[PDB]
Paper text:
Neuraminidase (NA) is a receptor-destroying enzyme that cleaves SA, facilitating the release of viral particles from infected cells. Owing to the functional constraints associated with the SA receptor interactions, the key contact residues of the FNI mAbs are highly conserved across IAV and IBV NAs.
Since the 2014/2015 Northern Hemisphere influenza season, a new N-linked glycosylation site at position 245 was introduced on the N2 NA as a result of the S245N and S247T substitutions. We next investigated the structural basis for the reduced binding affinities to N2 antigens bearing the N245 glycan. Structural analysis reveals that D107 in the FNI9 heavy chain complementarity-determinant region 3 mimics the interaction of the sialic acid carboxyl group with the three highly conserved arginine residues (R118, R292 and R371) of the neuraminidase catalytic site. By contrast, following binding of the FNI9 antibody, both the 242/252 loop and the N245 glycan undergo a dramatic conformational change to avoid a clash between the Fab and the glycan. The energy required for the induced fit of loop 242/252 could underlie the differences in affinity and neutralizing activity of the FNI mAbs against the recent N2 NAs.
Numbering used by the authors:
A (entry chain J), B (entry chain G), C (entry chain B): 82 to 469
D (entry chain C): 1 to 130
E (entry chain I): 1 to 110
Amino acid sequence: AEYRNWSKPQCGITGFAPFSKDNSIRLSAGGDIWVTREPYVSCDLDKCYQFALGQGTTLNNVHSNNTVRDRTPYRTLLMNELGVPFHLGTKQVCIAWSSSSCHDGKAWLHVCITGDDKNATASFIYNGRLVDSVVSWSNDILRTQESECVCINGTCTVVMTDGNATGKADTKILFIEEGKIVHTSKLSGSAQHVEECSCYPRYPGVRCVCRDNWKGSNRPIIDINIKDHSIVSSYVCSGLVGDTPRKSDSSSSSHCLNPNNEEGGHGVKGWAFDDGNDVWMGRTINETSRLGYETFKVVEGWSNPKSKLQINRQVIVDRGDRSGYSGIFSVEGKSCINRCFYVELIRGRKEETEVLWTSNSIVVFCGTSGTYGTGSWPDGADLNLMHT
Amino acid sequence: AEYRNWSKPQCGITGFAPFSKDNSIRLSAGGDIWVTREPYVSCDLDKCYQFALGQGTTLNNVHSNNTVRDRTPYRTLLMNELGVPFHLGTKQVCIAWSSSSCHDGKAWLHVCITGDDKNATASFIYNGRLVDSVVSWSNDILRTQESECVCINGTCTVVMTDGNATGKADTKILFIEEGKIVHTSKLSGSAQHVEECSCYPRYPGVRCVCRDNWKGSNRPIIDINIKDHSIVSSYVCSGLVGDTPRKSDSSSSSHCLNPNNEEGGHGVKGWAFDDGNDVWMGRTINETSRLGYETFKVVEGWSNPKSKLQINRQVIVDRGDRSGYSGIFSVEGKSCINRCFYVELIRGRKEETEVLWTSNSIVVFCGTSGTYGTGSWPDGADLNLMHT
Amino acid sequence: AEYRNWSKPQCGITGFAPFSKDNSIRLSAGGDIWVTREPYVSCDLDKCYQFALGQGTTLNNVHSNNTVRDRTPYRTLLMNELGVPFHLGTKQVCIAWSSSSCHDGKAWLHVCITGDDKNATASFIYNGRLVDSVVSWSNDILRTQESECVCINGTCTVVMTDGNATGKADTKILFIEEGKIVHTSKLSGSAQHVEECSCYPRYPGVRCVCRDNWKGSNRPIIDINIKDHSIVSSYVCSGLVGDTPRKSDSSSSSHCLNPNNEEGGHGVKGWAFDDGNDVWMGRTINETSRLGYETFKVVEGWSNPKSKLQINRQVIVDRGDRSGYSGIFSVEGKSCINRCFYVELIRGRKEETEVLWTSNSIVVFCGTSGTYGTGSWPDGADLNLMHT
Amino acid sequence: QVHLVQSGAEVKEPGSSVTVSCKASGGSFNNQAISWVRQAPGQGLEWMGGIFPISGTPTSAQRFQGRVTFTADESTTTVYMDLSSLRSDDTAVYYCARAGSDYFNRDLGWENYYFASWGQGTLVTVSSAS
Amino acid sequence: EIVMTQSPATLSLSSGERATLSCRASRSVSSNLAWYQQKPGQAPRLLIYDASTRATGFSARFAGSGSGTEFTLTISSLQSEDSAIYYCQQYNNWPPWTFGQGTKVEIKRT
Ligand SMILES: *[C@@H]1O[C@H](CO)[C@@H](O[C@@H]2O[C@H](CO)[C@@H](O[C@@H]3O[C@H](CO[C@H]4O[C@H](CO[C@H]5O[C@H](CO)[C@@H](O)[C@H](O)[C@@H]5O)[C@@H](O)[C@H](O[C@H]5O[C@H](CO)[C@@H](O)[C@H](O)[C@@H]5O)[C@@H]4O)[C@@H](O)[C@H](O[C@H]4O[C@H](CO)[C@@H](O)[C@H](O)[C@@H]4O[C@H]4O[C@H](CO)[C@@H](O)[C@H](O)[C@@H]4O)[C@@H]3O)[C@H](O)[C@H]2NC(C)=O)[C@H](O)[C@H]1NC(C)=O
Ligand SMILES: *[C@@H]1O[C@H](CO)[C@@H](O[C@@H]2O[C@H](CO)[C@@H](O[C@@H]3O[C@H](CO[C@H]4O[C@H](CO[C@H]5O[C@H](CO)[C@@H](O)[C@H](O)[C@@H]5O)[C@@H](O)[C@H](O[C@H]5O[C@H](CO)[C@@H](O)[C@H](O)[C@@H]5O)[C@@H]4O)[C@@H](O)[C@H](O[C@H]4O[C@H](CO)[C@@H](O)[C@H](O)[C@@H]4O[C@H]4O[C@H](CO)[C@@H](O)[C@H](O)[C@@H]4O)[C@@H]3O)[C@H](O)[C@H]2NC(C)=O)[C@H](O)[C@H]1NC(C)=O
Ligand SMILES: *[C@@H]1O[C@H](CO)[C@@H](O[C@@H]2O[C@H](CO)[C@@H](O[C@@H]3O[C@H](CO[C@H]4O[C@H](CO[C@H]5O[C@H](CO)[C@@H](O)[C@H](O)[C@@H]5O)[C@@H](O)[C@H](O[C@H]5O[C@H](CO)[C@@H](O)[C@H](O)[C@@H]5O)[C@@H]4O)[C@@H](O)[C@H](O[C@H]4O[C@H](CO)[C@@H](O)[C@H](O)[C@@H]4O[C@H]4O[C@H](CO)[C@@H](O)[C@H](O)[C@@H]4O)[C@@H]3O)[C@H](O)[C@H]2NC(C)=O)[C@H](O)[C@H]1NC(C)=O
Ligand SMILES: *[C@@H]1O[C@H](CO[C@@H]2O[C@@H](C)[C@@H](O)[C@@H](O)[C@@H]2O)[C@@H](O[C@@H]2O[C@H](CO)[C@@H](O)[C@H](O)[C@H]2NC(C)=O)[C@H](O)[C@H]1NC(C)=O
Ligand SMILES: *[C@@H]1O[C@H](CO[C@@H]2O[C@@H](C)[C@@H](O)[C@@H](O)[C@@H]2O)[C@@H](O[C@@H]2O[C@H](CO)[C@@H](O)[C@H](O)[C@H]2NC(C)=O)[C@H](O)[C@H]1NC(C)=O
Ligand SMILES: *[C@@H]1O[C@H](CO)[C@@H](O[C@@H]2O[C@H](CO)[C@@H](O)[C@H](O)[C@H]2NC(C)=O)[C@H](O)[C@H]1NC(C)=O
Ligand SMILES: *[C@@H]1O[C@H](CO)[C@@H](O[C@@H]2O[C@H](CO)[C@@H](O)[C@H](O)[C@H]2NC(C)=O)[C@H](O)[C@H]1NC(C)=O
Ligand SMILES: *[C@@H]1O[C@H](CO)[C@@H](O[C@@H]2O[C@H](CO)[C@@H](O)[C@H](O)[C@H]2NC(C)=O)[C@H](O)[C@H]1NC(C)=O
Ligand SMILES: *[C@@H]1O[C@H](CO)[C@@H](O[C@@H]2O[C@H](CO)[C@@H](O)[C@H](O)[C@H]2NC(C)=O)[C@H](O)[C@H]1NC(C)=O
Ligand SMILES: *[C@@H]1O[C@H](CO)[C@@H](O[C@@H]2O[C@H](CO)[C@@H](O)[C@H](O)[C@H]2NC(C)=O)[C@H](O)[C@H]1NC(C)=O
Ligand SMILES: *[C@@H]1O[C@H](CO)[C@@H](O[C@@H]2O[C@H](CO)[C@@H](O)[C@H](O)[C@H]2NC(C)=O)[C@H](O)[C@H]1NC(C)=O
Ligand SMILES: *[C@@H]1O[C@H](CO)[C@@H](O[C@@H]2O[C@H](CO)[C@@H](O)[C@H](O)[C@H]2NC(C)=O)[C@H](O)[C@H]1NC(C)=O
Ligand SMILES: *[C@@H]1O[C@H](CO)[C@@H](O[C@@H]2O[C@H](CO)[C@@H](O)[C@H](O)[C@H]2NC(C)=O)[C@H](O)[C@H]1NC(C)=O
Ligand SMILES: *[C@@H]1O[C@H](CO)[C@@H](O[C@@H]2O[C@H](CO)[C@@H](O)[C@H](O)[C@H]2NC(C)=O)[C@H](O)[C@H]1NC(C)=O
Ligand SMILES: [Ca+2]
Ligand SMILES: [Ca+2]
Ligand SMILES: [Ca+2]
Ligand SMILES: [Ca+2]
């Protein structure tokens, strides 16, 4: 089999059609299902796979208590075909409390980070064997995308960062070939904080939209050149901003180069992609909390920072129902590259006290050139019934 | 692999031999089995697969209560090899409260309908990726076959309807190639109401036998031309009618062009197929409720509407045991195309109050040129023992 | 496919990066997981597989009581892809209370020992069929490696022993081709007692590091010639010895030819491998009990028996947490043969009385030419919560 | 009740061999290990070795590893200890004793190897004198 | 391998007094320690096993205690029949099963 190149043009997108839903929390109330968070989707040449960071336990289990913790020695990257819920037969592909995965056209690469907060190891596992490893460079939680990496002509790229969650952070882009780290570029351009990037192939390059946990409620952008390893960065122009927390749409502002300094601190992993001068993006409906989820197109929102003209809005999760991380993934069609996204539907602690655990289900949507209607696809578990 | 063409002649059929039974409700009383309804069977080049619309829950679960409603955001199309019961390792192939699936010889097409009753979306998923989508046209519950679609030379056909399914206004036939909708024909001919069609390849065309919920207890027929997208419709002539409710065989009548206007309201999904002038068909044994199931041949029943001469009767489910939807599927043999059918065996609410859930098992039968005996293969769960 | 030859050079190793963890005991507290001990890892051309000797029972089961005994008629060799925990869908590849497995490049060989202590049978199963068998020769617990065998040019080698494993009398090396025993060499050289060998390809030969349960706390070495079936043996020179129990590092001694006669009685399965004159090895952190696990390189420790200069230490399991058997396995890379190891994490009886069962989880590490950080990856089950 | 009956006192010349026997009073031996412990005049206890009467795994201390062997038979319901290449210094009381231990684990060794029941102690004496 | 040291070598106390005997292993034996009584001209008899469980043949006046590296046998209210050699014995999972050199108990009567 040949390496992927993603050289087809981007598909025409009128909005997103419903694709998959795992119903993991509802099935957990009568079933041996894994506790997870920070899910993502990635696809090989034939088939899409759901990934998530397990908490080393099933949900109906004594070990599901205190699974609100971000990092433990027991976290492992789970992998299944998309729509197969994470049951006990699920494969743990690596030890990981932070991860990224992608298929280069020949085999899967997994980037798997684990160990001490102050001295973590990132393992690179390719074609089912450990090929390379790198130590934390800033000794303060080495971390990566929590979504798919992107491979063009066998060169995979992954964004990785280390250092302060609400201060200056040291971000590198690693270029990987068959699991071997072949090059490493420091972040360059005007992005001031860069975390949990959602990346897509935009041949000949890769483009990433990220979380700014310090100064922006507007999202950072990274452009990655695969051929010469050069890096450029900026922020999503649109006056409608994608991060959470953020200011109300009637009062929010944005800048193409700089963090907007509006509700800058904290954030949530999300995505956006260019469609000429327009931008498609998804965000939580609530401006201060991860409730609901909506997608829309902003007219000229990729290049005009004063633009707030939205169109083609869709509610994916209603404003009353819990949301979480979300990320883009790309699927090669017959004639064009389609953009799809997933939403993590987090349930339990700390916001819901009926249960002692924290876990997620997932809902997944794909871009459509056709037509679509309306709905709302929340997690749908009743924590008052599966109550402790 | 080349696309399917179904160009072999129909097999000689003397009746139906037993093929498969899933035992899902019996196994649910001691294991994690999915709650389902509206099942169907379809086969690729090598294996038959069982499909069903899940209720987003296992049966021994808090979420299995109130699973009598047919549309919710959590329903997903389940897919397994035939005879593998729907355990937690089952794949959810799409978000769907109404569906149809078929294999074109190269890959699976799934037609998946979900969203708001007043504004639903049909997603076309082919070779594991979303290729196309269409919005509800009558804005009143877009719906499809709840059985296999049929593909000839890569062109798949699916019957879809909206509103109260009135004729040319509400019912459309979609022609799909590798997941892309290539053409759409309005219903034409004398079929007045058309829902839940059971379709079979009848090369060079496709033939469908459907449910009339308003005027007929006789079943509508649709003939679909793959080459020129033309549509023709009528009703099954047979004086022994296939719908439920219906009049007693001693008093029932039928018409070849029109609904018979006898117990026209309501219905059940079923099937029939031509054998020259004769018709093979299955129906519930009880005339007013979905109890038992029987198949028989009616002599001249495809062309003579006054004929009530039945022969080759078989009881599949005895008249005391619950049945449900039933549908045809076609299996390519060495020298001929065989016809097979499945029966949904519905258990629980509303008719059984021992339990809080509504779910089904299946039994499956295939046409035989050989010889066969007698039996009854009901669901067989004791709801008095697995009682709430 | 052609047979494996392992003819590539050994990879440059700076230490070990985290690779996989099964979380079996944590998952057992809420699911149907197999009771196991004496696990090991082995890899075919594409994928690594986890193996373990089952106790014929799940952990949450009436039969999990008294599972501390190592030989019963119900023990079976379990096999899964690495990271897939041993759930009920796991394959029992053979009847065995002692075993070894390896893939010759065409198919799996399993060496499976079972039957009476005084008269056991070793079955050779290759490509899914029993090809050969041999009876106990010393009539006192025939046993093998409890880790992968090694195959070069289709000739697999397994170390086997009987009685108190005394030298040339009790220990034999069996040469096997496609499951047929083609030759058998008595142990030769100065190794006095040889059990549970951990073996690695060292082309053109195979090298094994073993357990001495009677005289040495230093480990025995076996060199096996594949071309002429000749055998040579000695002990790991290193002044820092690898067995448990052993003397404190400040007081321990070693010998290249003879057992050191320091805490010679008893032992634990472990591993070491040459890196020119240096030796990489793993051992329990505690000198008298199987608590913690550490790996390090000893400078000149393969050839200088007075050397105690360690470097590149890593804690794999902290000194407070239980460990168990450990063994090497080899993974073929693009340009070199990598060395990887697993640690059995034993929980329950005899040392923990909170539970009635004895079982293990695993953690797995691979050699890296890159860089790594620090951590501790213990079993992590709370037996006070899943208490009897 | 199970208790052990030993062979009568033995007299032997240096370099010779002796067979000491230990028979079960209960008509059968369970798999509890039968062990041999000796006591030189005016001195402490010394474990020589033992064997499981059914599973058969034999074990011996280093000072007796060449000179001693053990065998068992359920039919005669007796364990026999053979001490060969005798010396004047091996003049001692030889007690057979039943250990709590009844299984050997390849990995973990022996549980409960404490002597619960003891025989009469066969006095074995080695000298040239008649 | 594991060496057992026992003290005192000889102990003497009057009837009705409480005797204490001590045993030390060269390395920790994890409570796998037994005690034996040997009256003159007879086979030894099991007093204690698992460092504190007393055998069927002895009353509560014989108390075994300790763990790890050091152990003790306490004989409450000495009686005429107690004059015997007492020995400790380790059985920490692997051979050899070494005994202590023994303590002679001599009753200090009038
Ligand atoms: C069934 O499902 C379908 C498909 O999902 C549903 O259709 C979808 O419906 C949503 C509703 O949210 C639409 O998204 C929304 O789009 C509007 C912008 O679009 C409107 O304005 C356009 C511009 O209008 C100006 O210019 C024209 C000339 O060009 C003038 O004539 C006007 O007077 C104006 O000056 C206009 O071009 C659009 O027309 C097209 O679309 C409609 C369908 O929507 C068709 O009928 C037309 O024929 C034509 O094709 C259209 O009129 C945004 O304003 C929406 O965002 C606002 O609303 C959100 C809540 O809904 C809110 O959360 C946002 O924050 C935002 O609100 C803020 O901004 C507003 C202005 O932007 C302020 O007014 C407001 O106070 C606040 O400050 C949203 O993005 C989708 O486009 C539509 N999708 C498709 C493909 O049709 C359908 O509704 C469902 N049907 C049923 C029965 O359920
Ligand atoms: C073991 O398993 C096998 C296989 O499953 C079982 O065999 C099967 O048995 C069933 C019984 O239901 C048969 O189906 C029934 O077929 C009859 C029609 O067939 C009869 O009539 C034919 C026409 O008769 C007229 O013409 C001839 C001349 O040609 C004249 O002589 C007559 O007088 C008539 O005028 C005739 O051709 C048939 O003969 C052939 O078939 C039989 C086997 O059936 C052979 O023995 C013969 O050799 C020959 O090959 C035959 O005589 C239908 O009438 C049945 O439908 C009625 O009954 C149902 C209940 O069983 C009921 O639900 C229907 O509503 C229907 O009843 C209504 O209609 C009736 C008239 O049609 C009225 O009388 C009635 O009151 C009511 O109004 C049904 O379709 C299968 O054909 C048969 N299958 C095979 C392959 O043989 C076998 O029974 C089992 N054995 C055991 C021990 O369990
Ligand atoms: C983040 O993760 C990484 C990776 O895990 C961590 O790095 C790793 O840290 C461990 C710390 O335990 C290191 O292992 C240890 O190595 C030392 C040996 O190394 C020291 O001495 C070397 C020899 O010294 C002579 O030569 C030098 C010149 O080179 C002269 O100056 C001297 O005077 C001597 O003549 C020396 O070469 C080493 O320097 C090199 O390596 C270090 C990294 O270690 C680099 O910084 C340097 O630049 C240079 O390249 C170094 O100074 C061992 O002593 C350790 O074993 C002892 O300690 C254990 C407890 O930790 C204990 O269990 C052992 O039994 C043992 O202790 C006994 O023996 C000692 C003498 O041998 C006695 O001193 C002691 O009292 C006792 O009797 C251990 O093996 C890894 O090498 C290192 N790995 C890598 C790749 O760097 C990092 O620490 C983590 N960071 C954080 C923030 O968590
Ligand atoms: C992460 O950064 C924040 C923000 O301040 C930055 O980091 C400082 C160390 C210093 O270099 C500043 O100039 C930077 O702007 C740190 O927040 C401070 O936290 C301390 C208590 O720990 C508090 O007393 C200060 O008032 C905080 N300052 C501000 C500006 O908020 C934070 O400590 C950094 N985290 C770590 C682990 O160093
Ligand atoms: C391990 O066992 C072998 C086998 O010895 C036999 O079994 C013993 C338990 C006991 O019954 C012996 O009398 C048997 O001979 C031991 O090998 C013997 O070693 C001695 C030297 O000490 C030598 O003179 C004999 O010829 C050997 N016997 C045979 C049959 O070859 C070995 O010493 C034992 N090692 C350990 C550590 O237990
Ligand atoms: C990217 O990859 C595709 C294949 O996925 C390339 O298309 C193939 O090109 C070779 C050589 O010209 C032909 O032999 C094949 O028949 C082509 N296959 C298809 C399906 O077209 C494509 O040329 C590559 N493009 C770039 C820009 O690298
Ligand atoms: C990805 O790989 C392909 C193949 O190596 C590159 O396309 C080739 O480019 C060279 C120079 O222009 C030509 O000689 C070839 O004919 C091209 N092949 C095809 C199929 O187009 C492509 O440039 C690479 N792209 C990146 C971003 O690395
Ligand atoms: C956004 O989410 C927050 C958090 O759930 C909502 O905050 C609640 O607001 C109501 C009053 O409107 C209070 O009574 C609750 O106590 C608040 N909850 C918490 C947990 O603080 C908020 O209403 C949402 N805002 C919008 C615009 O949707
Ligand atoms: C329908 O498909 C079948 C294959 O499933 C076609 O049969 C092949 O026809 C070609 C051309 O005559 C032959 O070379 C092959 O040997 C045939 N294969 C088999 C298995 O028979 C068939 O021609 C197609 N029918 C139509 C009408 O196009
Ligand atoms: C299905 O496909 C086959 C192959 O394309 C069609 O059969 C061909 O039809 C044309 C026009 O009549 C002929 O020129 C070819 O010789 C035919 N080939 C064979 C093998 O028969 C067939 O007509 C198509 N049928 C449908 C229903 O679409
Ligand atoms: C068809 O099914 C119904 C139940 O759905 C049967 O109803 C029973 O009818 C008898 C009289 O024929 C009454 O005595 C019972 O009380 C009815 N039960 C219920 C629950 O309504 C009916 O008998 C069936 N009819 C035929 C002809 O099969
Ligand atoms: C070891 O095995 C490899 C194959 O796994 C041998 O390398 C191959 O040799 C053949 C014949 O020359 C070539 O056709 C292949 O292309 C080679 N493959 C690779 C990956 O190099 C190798 O020669 C064997 N070595 C020994 C010493 O037997
Ligand atoms: C493994 O197999 C290969 C193939 O037979 C052996 O290498 C060959 O050795 C012969 C004799 O020297 C040569 O004529 C061939 O040219 C060699 N082929 C290659 C690819 O090297 C090798 O010696 C065998 N090794 C072992 C350990 O059995
Ligand atoms: C090595 O391991 C042993 C055995 O696990 C440890 O022994 C423990 O020691 C303390 C007293 O210091 C006792 O209270 C515990 O009961 C012992 N544990 C067991 C299971 O017996 C020992 O502390 C460790 N020592 C070192 C130096 O690593
Ligand atoms: Ca922010
Ligand atoms: Ca269960
Ligand atoms: Ca009707
Ligand atoms: Ca040893």
